[PDB]
Amino acid sequence: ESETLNPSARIMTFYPTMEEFRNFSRYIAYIESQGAHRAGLAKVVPPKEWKPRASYDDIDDLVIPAPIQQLVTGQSGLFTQYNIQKKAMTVREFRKIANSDKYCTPRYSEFEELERKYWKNLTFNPPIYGADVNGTLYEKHVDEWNIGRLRTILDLVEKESGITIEGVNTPYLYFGMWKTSFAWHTEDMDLYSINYLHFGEPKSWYSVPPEHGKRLERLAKGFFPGSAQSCEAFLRHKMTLISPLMLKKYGIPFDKVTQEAGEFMITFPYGYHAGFNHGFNCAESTNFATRRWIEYGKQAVLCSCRKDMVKISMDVFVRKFQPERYKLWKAGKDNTVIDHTLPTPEAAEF
Ligand SMILES: O=C(O)C[C@H](C(=O)O)[C@H](O)C(=O)O
Ligand code: NI
Ligand SMILES: [Zn+2]
Numbered sequence: 001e002s003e004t005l006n007p008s009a010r011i012m013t014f015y016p017t018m019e020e021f022r023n024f025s026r027y028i029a030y031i032e033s034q035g036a037h038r039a040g041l042a043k044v045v046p047p048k049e050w051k052p053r054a055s056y057d058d059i060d061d062l063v064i065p066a067p068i069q070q071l072v073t074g075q076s077g078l079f080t081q082y083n084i085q086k087k088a089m090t091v092r093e094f095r096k097i098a099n100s101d102k103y104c105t106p107r108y109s110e111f112e113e114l115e116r117k118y119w120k121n122l123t124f125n126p127p128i129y130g131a132d133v134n135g136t137l138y139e140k141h142v143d144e145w146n147i148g149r150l151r152t153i154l155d156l157v158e159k160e161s162g163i164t165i166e167g168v169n170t171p172y173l174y175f176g177m178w179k180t181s182f183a184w185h186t187e188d189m190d191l192y193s194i195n196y197l198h199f200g201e202p203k204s205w206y207s208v209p210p211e212h213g214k215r216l217e218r219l220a221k222g223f224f225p226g227s228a229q230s231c232e233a234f235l236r237h238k239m240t241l242i243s244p245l246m247l248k249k250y251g252i253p254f255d256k257v258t259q260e261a262g263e264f265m266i267t268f269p270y271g272y273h274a275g276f277n278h279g280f281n282c283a284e285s286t287n288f289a290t291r292r293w294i295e296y297g298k299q300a301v302l303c304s305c306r307k308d309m310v311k312i313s314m315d316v317f318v319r320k321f322q323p324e325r326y327k328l329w330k331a332g333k334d335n336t337v338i339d340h341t342l343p344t345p346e347a348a349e350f
Pocket of ligand 3: 230231232233234237303304305306307308
């Protein structure tokens with residue numbers, strides 16, 4: 001029944017009306033009822049009515065505390081990205097560096113051309129990424145799809161323990177320029193993410209279906225054996241870049257999509273994704289959960305080498321939503337197997 005919908009696990013695009021846009025968890029349950037999650041990634045275009053902020057002229061003086069210079073080493077479609085932290089700078093400062101002739105977007109015809117240039121010049125002229133900036137660009141009273149307060153069950157983490165994990169249950173802002181990259185990864189604890197591109201040049205995405213995620217890992221282990229030996233989940237370091245031709249070459253299924261200013265992307269539990277920014281832009285993101293995520297959370301394979309320290313205690317979730325399995329789970333005898341094609345239970349309404 002669920003296998004029926006989006007059997008090609010292709011990236012789907014949604015155009016919710018305002019009535020649908022109002023309830024966040026509801027619409028997530030909906031797009032999953034349509035099989036959107038099978039691609040690991042979905043685009044959601046909000047109603048033209050809606051805007052999260054009246055004007056982005058207010059922000060040239062906002063500080064980016066920890067700009068990141070992205071050095072990329074590799075060849076033949078395989079790369080490792082090293083971060084070099086630069087001194088703080090303002091949005092105005094960043095935009096100036098971004099739009100400069102040294103760092104700006106090259107001229108091109110079709111998207112495929114910008115993409116080939118990206119994979120050709122990835123290792124040259126290392127760009128700067130205004131990344132992991134704590135903050136939101138939502139106006140205080142915007143009640144729809146507010147990344148600052150989506151009100152999903154991920155809230156049980158702060159609610160129960162007071163713990164906040166930056167960018168995960170709090171928002172992050174990402175200022176990009178041409179050729180700035182995000183490496184292949186799933187979210188921490190294999191959560192969902194929501195990504196809103198406030199303004200600027202597009203952000204292009206690659207994605208691998210969760211049902212084929214393990215195959216991408218096998219490949220990654222094979223190409224980076226030293227990293228594989230030192231960490232059980234080295235892709236969580238977010239340093240590993242792998243071109244579409246390489247995936248194609250080794251039969252890893254994947255899809256592409258380009259995100260325009262004013263568009264949302266949703267990534268789904270155990271959805272590997274990666275991509276790059278086209279030029280100067282600004283994106284806001286955080287993680288979130290649904291009931292379906294819980295099993296992913298329980299089974300998430302985490303970074304063992306301490307480079308990624310994000311760890312959420314699953315105990316509250318299993319107690320509250322899997323009471324019949326708590327004893328079993330707590331005693332390590334819970335061998336539930338995950339079906340990546342099933343939608344979250346909240347979609348029973350649909
Ligand atoms: O850019 C990154 O380093 C992570 C990325 C982002 O937040 O832009 C993430 O893929 C996501 O959107 O969930
Ligand atoms: Ni991500
Ligand atoms: Zn690690």
